[PDB]
Amino acid sequence: MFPKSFMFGASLSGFQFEMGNPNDIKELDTQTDWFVWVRDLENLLNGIVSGDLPENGAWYWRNYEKIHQLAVDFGMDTLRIGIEWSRIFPTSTKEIPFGEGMLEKLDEIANKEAVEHYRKMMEDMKAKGLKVFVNLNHFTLPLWIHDPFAVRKGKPTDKLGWVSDDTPKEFAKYAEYIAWKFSDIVDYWSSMNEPHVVAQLGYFQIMAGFPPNYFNPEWYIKSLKNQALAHNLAYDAIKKHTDKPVGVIYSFTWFDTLKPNDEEIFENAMWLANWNYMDQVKDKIDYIGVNYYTRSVIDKLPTPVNFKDFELNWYTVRGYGYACPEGGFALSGRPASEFGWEIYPEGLYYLLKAIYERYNKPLIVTENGIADEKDKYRSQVIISHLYAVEKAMNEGVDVRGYLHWSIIDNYEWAKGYSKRFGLAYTDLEKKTYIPRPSMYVFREIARTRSIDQFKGYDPYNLMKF
Ligand SMILES: [Co+2]
Ligand SMILES: [Co+2]
Questions:
Q1: Which residues in 216-227 are b (16+ Cβ under 10 Å) and which e?
Q2: What total of structural domains would you count in the chain?
Q3: Residue 146 in 3-state DSSP?
Q4: Rounded to an integer, what distance in angstroms lies between the CA atom of residue 77 and that of residue 10?
Q5: Residue 241 to residues 125, 180, 237, 244, 440: CA-CA distances in angstroms?
Q6: Which ligand is nearest to the CA of 64?
Q7: Exposed e or buried b per residue across 53-92, where buried means at least 16 C-beta atoms within 10 angstroms of its C-beta
Q8: Ligand nearest to the CA of 296
Q9: 30 by DSSP, 3-state: which?
Q10: Is 347 helix (H, G, I), strand (E, B) or coil?
Q11: CA 384 to ligand 2 centroid distance, Å
Q12: H-helix or E-strand containing 367?
């Protein structure tokens, strides 16, 4: 059995879930880079973004009580939710310095209606018996922090997002403000979510449709380092107001080489994708949030590319990992999701071992899930990834929970509503949430704290390791 303290739950963000009534001006958060990005004509006409709009979404801002009750009804004991910086501080905090009197000046400029709303939502979680896990940043940034169109077009701006040295400083102010206001109800803190994704998709792998979509390898590394500085500052600032655990939620990639005897490229890819950032924050983490979807298979680049800050001597092989046919199969034979992501739960076991060996911190799986609107695989995904967790734990790895991504279908960034990751189907016309069959399997595992009753049926051969 998993320990009674092991957390079963789900993860959500603010932007992908909160909005749902386009005509409520207090709910409509017009002031993020992402909000404007998804309606940009260049992006729309070129299919860089989907055409779907987040204000037509799942309506967590208004329907939180029903979503919290769904979570308890399906056996969850914890939800991780996002707070949008843009909602708390719609206007710049750049004129309010660190020091004596900072918190009171920030309270005078903060959007207290948003602060009170987040409070109500977390009070509801608490009333329902759910542990409150707050993550302070989840990709979106306030428009006074990031003007993605000025950046995209190379036009002068101070609003450079994570490239601006001002950003980590303002973020530290925001983190301290929130910890000061909510230290009495938050059980667990994360500074930010998948910072390597923000940096890599923003400034390096610019075919994913993320802001500012400006290829600059130096800005890739700079935004990554500025995010690590932001985390470190945030940890110190939150800890002024609480002794509760503070960590970061990171997207880890497992790499397999195409050919044997390529350990150099393995270590290079692991460092760039995982260890570069994590080594910068390692002195200021009480736990590591492991987000895991699939692996990448890599091979040696005939001609390495040298950048100012790093060498690239490998490339990503098509047909495995994140690079499979959407709704098809990997070259391995494994099914792939409707995002083209191979089912590879052994990657999570390998990473739990590697991460624990490197850092020796408690781990929580903070995201794992699949784009699967017909529920073809999601039960086996849950079971086989928990099999991975159990195997790691059996070998002495300290894992404290599993939060699925996600409890409901939501707005998947540049793909919009086209990728459906929910345990429950979201009817976006009625704003109602209908548990898929896999959500009953999740409830069974959470309630019994076991997968032993599932293990002997393995139709996709996912638990043979
Ligand atoms: Co309300
Ligand atoms: Co292979």
A1: beebbbbbbbbb
A2: 1
A3: strand
A4: 9
A5: 21, 6, 8, 9, 39
A6: 1
A7: bbbbbbbbbbbbeebbebbeebbbbbbbbbbbbbbbbbee
A8: 2
A9: coil
A10: helix
A11: 20
A12: strand 363-367
Q: Which two tokens stand for residue 151?
A: 């950046």
Q: Which of 366, 383, 375, 362 is nearest to 446 (CA)?
A: 383
Q: Which two tokens stand for residue 209?
A: 């449709």
Place of tokens 């655990």: 245
Tell me which amino acid residue 5 is: S
Integer angstrom CA distances of residue 462 from 298, 335, 386? 22, 10, 11
Distance 335 CA to ligand 2 centre (A): 15
| Residue 363 belongs to domain with CATH number | 3.20.20.80
Eight-class DSSP state of 282: G
Question: Given the structure tokens 């925001």, which residue do they identify?
Answer: 174
H helix or E strand, kind and range, residue 67: helix 60-73
Q: Give the residue numbers annotated as catalytic, written as ranges.
A: 367
- CB within 8 A of 225, min separation 6: which ones? 280
Task: Give the determination technique.
Answer: X-ray
Domain of residue 190 covers 1-465
Ordered strands of the 311-316 beta sheet: 254-257, 295-306, 311-316
Distance of CA 51 from the midpoint of ligand 1 (Å):
28
Residue 449 class from Cβ within 10 Å (0-12 exposed, 13-18 middle, 19+ buried)?
middle
Task: For residues 134 and 148, give the distance between their C-alpha atoms in angstroms, rounded to a whole number.
Answer: 26
- Region of residue 47 (phi > 0: left; psi between -120 and 50: alpha; otherwise: beta): left
Half-sphere exposure of 18 (CA within 13 A, CB side): 23
